[PDB]
Ligand binder design. Sequence first.
Ligand SMILES: *[C@@H]1O[C@H](CO)[C@@H](O[C@@H]2O[C@H](CO)[C@@H](O[C@@H]3O[C@H](CO)[C@@H](O)[C@H](O)[C@@H]3O)[C@H](O)[C@H]2NC(C)=O)[C@H](O)[C@H]1NC(C)=O
Ligand SMILES: *[C@@H]1O[C@H](CO)[C@@H](O[C@@H]2O[C@H](CO)[C@@H](O[C@@H]3O[C@H](CO)[C@@H](O)[C@H](O)[C@@H]3O)[C@H](O)[C@H]2NC(C)=O)[C@H](O)[C@H]1NC(C)=O
Ligand SMILES: CC(C)=CCC/C(C)=C/CC/C(C)=C/CC/C(C)=C/Cc1c(C)c(O)c2ccccc2c1O
Ligand SMILES: *[C@@H]1O[C@H](CO)[C@@H](O[C@@H]2O[C@H](CO)[C@@H](O)[C@H](O)[C@H]2NC(C)=O)[C@H](O)[C@H]1NC(C)=O
Ligand SMILES: CC(C)CCC[C@@H](C)[C@H]1CC[C@H]2[C@@H]3CC=C4C[C@@H](O)CC[C@]4(C)[C@H]3CC[C@]12C
Lengths: 690, 29
Amino acid sequence: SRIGKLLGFEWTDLSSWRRLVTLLNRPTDPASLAVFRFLFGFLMVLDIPQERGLSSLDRKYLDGLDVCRFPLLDALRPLPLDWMYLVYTIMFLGALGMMLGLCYRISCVLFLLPYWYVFLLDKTSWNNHSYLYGLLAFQLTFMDANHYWSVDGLLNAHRRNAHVPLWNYAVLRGQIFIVYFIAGVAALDADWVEGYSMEYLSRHWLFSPFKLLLSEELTSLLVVHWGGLLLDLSAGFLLFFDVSRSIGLFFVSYFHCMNSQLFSIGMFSYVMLASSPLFCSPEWPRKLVSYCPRRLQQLLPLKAAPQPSVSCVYKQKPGLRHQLGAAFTLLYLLEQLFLPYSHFLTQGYNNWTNGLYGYSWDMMVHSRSHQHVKITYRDGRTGELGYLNPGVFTQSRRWKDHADMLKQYATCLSRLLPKYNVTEPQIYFDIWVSINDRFQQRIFDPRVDIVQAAWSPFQRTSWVQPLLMDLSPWRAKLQEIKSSLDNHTEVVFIADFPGLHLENFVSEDLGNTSIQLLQGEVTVELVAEQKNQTLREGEKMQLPAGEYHKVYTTSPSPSCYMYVYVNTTELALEQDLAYLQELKEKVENGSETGPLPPELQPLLEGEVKGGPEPTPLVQTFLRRQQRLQEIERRRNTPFHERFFRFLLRKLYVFRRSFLMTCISLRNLILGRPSLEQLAQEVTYANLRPF
Amino acid sequence: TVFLDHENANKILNRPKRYNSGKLEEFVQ
Ligand SMILES: *[C@@H]1O[C@H](CO)[C@@H](O[C@@H]2O[C@H](CO)[C@@H](O[C@@H]3O[C@H](CO)[C@@H](O)[C@H](O)[C@@H]3O)[C@H](O)[C@H]2NC(C)=O)[C@H](O)[C@H]1NC(C)=O
Ligand SMILES: *[C@@H]1O[C@H](CO)[C@@H](O[C@@H]2O[C@H](CO)[C@@H](O[C@@H]3O[C@H](CO)[C@@H](O)[C@H](O)[C@@H]3O)[C@H](O)[C@H]2NC(C)=O)[C@H](O)[C@H]1NC(C)=O
Ligand SMILES: CC(C)=CCC/C(C)=C/CC/C(C)=C/CC/C(C)=C/Cc1c(C)c(O)c2ccccc2c1O
Ligand SMILES: *[C@@H]1O[C@H](CO)[C@@H](O[C@@H]2O[C@H](CO)[C@@H](O)[C@H](O)[C@H]2NC(C)=O)[C@H](O)[C@H]1NC(C)=O
Ligand SMILES: CC(C)CCC[C@@H](C)[C@H]1CC[C@H]2[C@@H]3CC=C4C[C@@H](O)CC[C@]4(C)[C@H]3CC[C@]12C
């Protein structure tokens, strides 16, 4: 029938459970499943020393170090450094076995268990492509991916060129479609459609051909934003149908190739590229081998027809294995569709977006900008106030946007502080964030002690400041102001809630600073003079430099205002430097016949030898000139040199990871050697290549 | 510098080192 030739099955196959099980276990060619299996394992091997964190294990998990960590479960803790190296060694071996097909099921488990343990250890390392790797490994554990091109085929005669169940391809194809489609739906947000996210991505040289027929603004809006949205929503349908597969393959290949150079996402683009041929005929690799010379065929996988396999149902009564496989493909695909939209039961992980980042397929939709962070503590006994350096005991900055991470950070601080003579501290946070070029605003209540604050996984957090969505239309006006400013002027846009105030200390270098009111009403107090002045819409007031001032939001609705300032110290210094350069040019061109000043002598000589120490202005000028020369030298570098340096950097990363693992494995098995011996070995492992 | 002082803590108009916007999807060294 027409439907049978289009979808690959018929309505009769869904009539009963037995028919459904029979259809899902239909024998299929394993050539395509094997090629993807090899490619996935090869890329996993490459990724382990680069992004999984093998080359920085000693720095991250240093023994006897004070660090605040963010595990999903508070009871999950890492192992000592030597045992952490063993975990990565087992993960590496499992990936190698998967790529080769040697002891397929054991190798799959060896990769899977260590991978998820490391993933759950750090919530700050979660992203969409790392989440996908764990999903792909989980699926392949139950698949017969070692039936065509693997070592297991040589070890066992029954696993050499054998059929595989159809649900092996259905689950993999369904997973890839979900990644495309859910991403396209998430890209339906107003910010994406209007072109606010990644509004500067069209300046890359890779977009040169488009600019020959479009403007910069038009190219960004149509190509980058609407083009990406269209591909996500139609990539799955294009690949599935064979009348449009050729067009889809070219479009997705171009889409992924560009992304590999526009962003730094590790192996994401290469994994997606490899998954594309999974929609083609399951025997495409075998057909390609058929077009090879007879001599070359002796070094390639078999080309004959696959042999029957017990995993499939042949036109018999299905057994337990077939029924379980049918159940898995239905339940697993159902769970994948639901989870990205489950952010209504776990209400404790929503602050401004939905849930933790990593399992919603929302790539590059929201961009954040942080302006300032302040951490305050008050001693429980003494009662004195103090301030901490933001992110003092952290290895990442993601704690600023999540209430679950902030609660962990505050608990960690209260445990460490007593060792610095602080007893029973109370900690407050003041973080200013802006999302997609909006007004800068607070994200948490600055009057709440987070140590004693209440947090639950299933309850909405009480001390999270709502996002001011009503002020979004101001973005057009904000850009207009920022485009009319002078080359030496800067502006900051702030919105504050009623009943709150902002305390600001203006640096001495920021001469000529002023504040103007855009909406609402505020009161500005000069702390030193104890003077209060009220402001009205469109009113601007000058502020002193090197002093304190406070802004009170007295309106019943949030107020908006902007800061305009100029760095006077830098401006004067640059003018002096420019004047010196003009004088030097006058000397060089033959003018200024008069004797050069003693300070100008170092400029001509370029080396301070046998003379008085040069003034800071001369040193600054020399440093700037040297920096410009280095920049010019870096630009004038042939492509061959650039590629060679790139390969050398990779070689050092791979070599260091191997040597550090050997040292740790030696300690575990034989025993720790003398300190002098250990110091020498670490020095050897830190040597650069070549 | 674990401990700060009043002037540095409240200095809002300071050169932000993390001026560039982040995506949360890009790998960081
Ligand atoms: C402190 O810095 C601000 C911002 O740079 C200075 O404001 C600038 O003031 C000058 C006049 O003194 C403005 O120039 C005049 O404004 C019109 C407006 O249309 C403009 O077309 C011309 O340039 C005109 O001469 C200038 O525009 C304005 N800055 C900006 C970016 O608009 C201010 O003067 C500084 N204060 C001190 C004491 O130096
Ligand atoms: C206004 O301009 C002055 C320069 O005229 C700025 O001072 C400079 O600030 C930068 C950081 O923004 C300093 O760079 C960093 O500081 C450390 C510690 O001093 C130094 O080791 C390195 O240079 C480091 O990169 C810089 O040293 C400092 N001074 C100079 C002479 O450049 C000032 O920050 C500006 N003020 C504002 C609020 O924009
Ligand atoms: C061929 C012609 C005439 C026009 C083509 C017109 C076309 C398709 C331009 C495309 C270039 C362009 C503007 C690419 C950035 C768009 C963005 C931000 C996609 C978001 C995104 C990103 C960043 C990823 O890393 C992904 C990785 C794996 C899977 C999905 C991913 C994904 O969805
Ligand atoms: C200037 O006016 C502000 C208006 O807010 C005063 O700030 C208030 O001070 C009183 C105590 O005098 C507090 O009870 C309020 O809570 C403060 N306002 C807030 C935080 O909304 C400020 O004291 C005045 N300054 C001077 C020097 O008189
Ligand atoms: C002590 C621990 C870390 C070691 C054992 C790892 C366990 C917990 C791993 C192995 C397989 C994993 C599961 C594999 C696949 C999925 C589907 C995904 O959509 C949600 C997570 C979930 C449900 C994983 C949860 C964690 C998991 C059960």
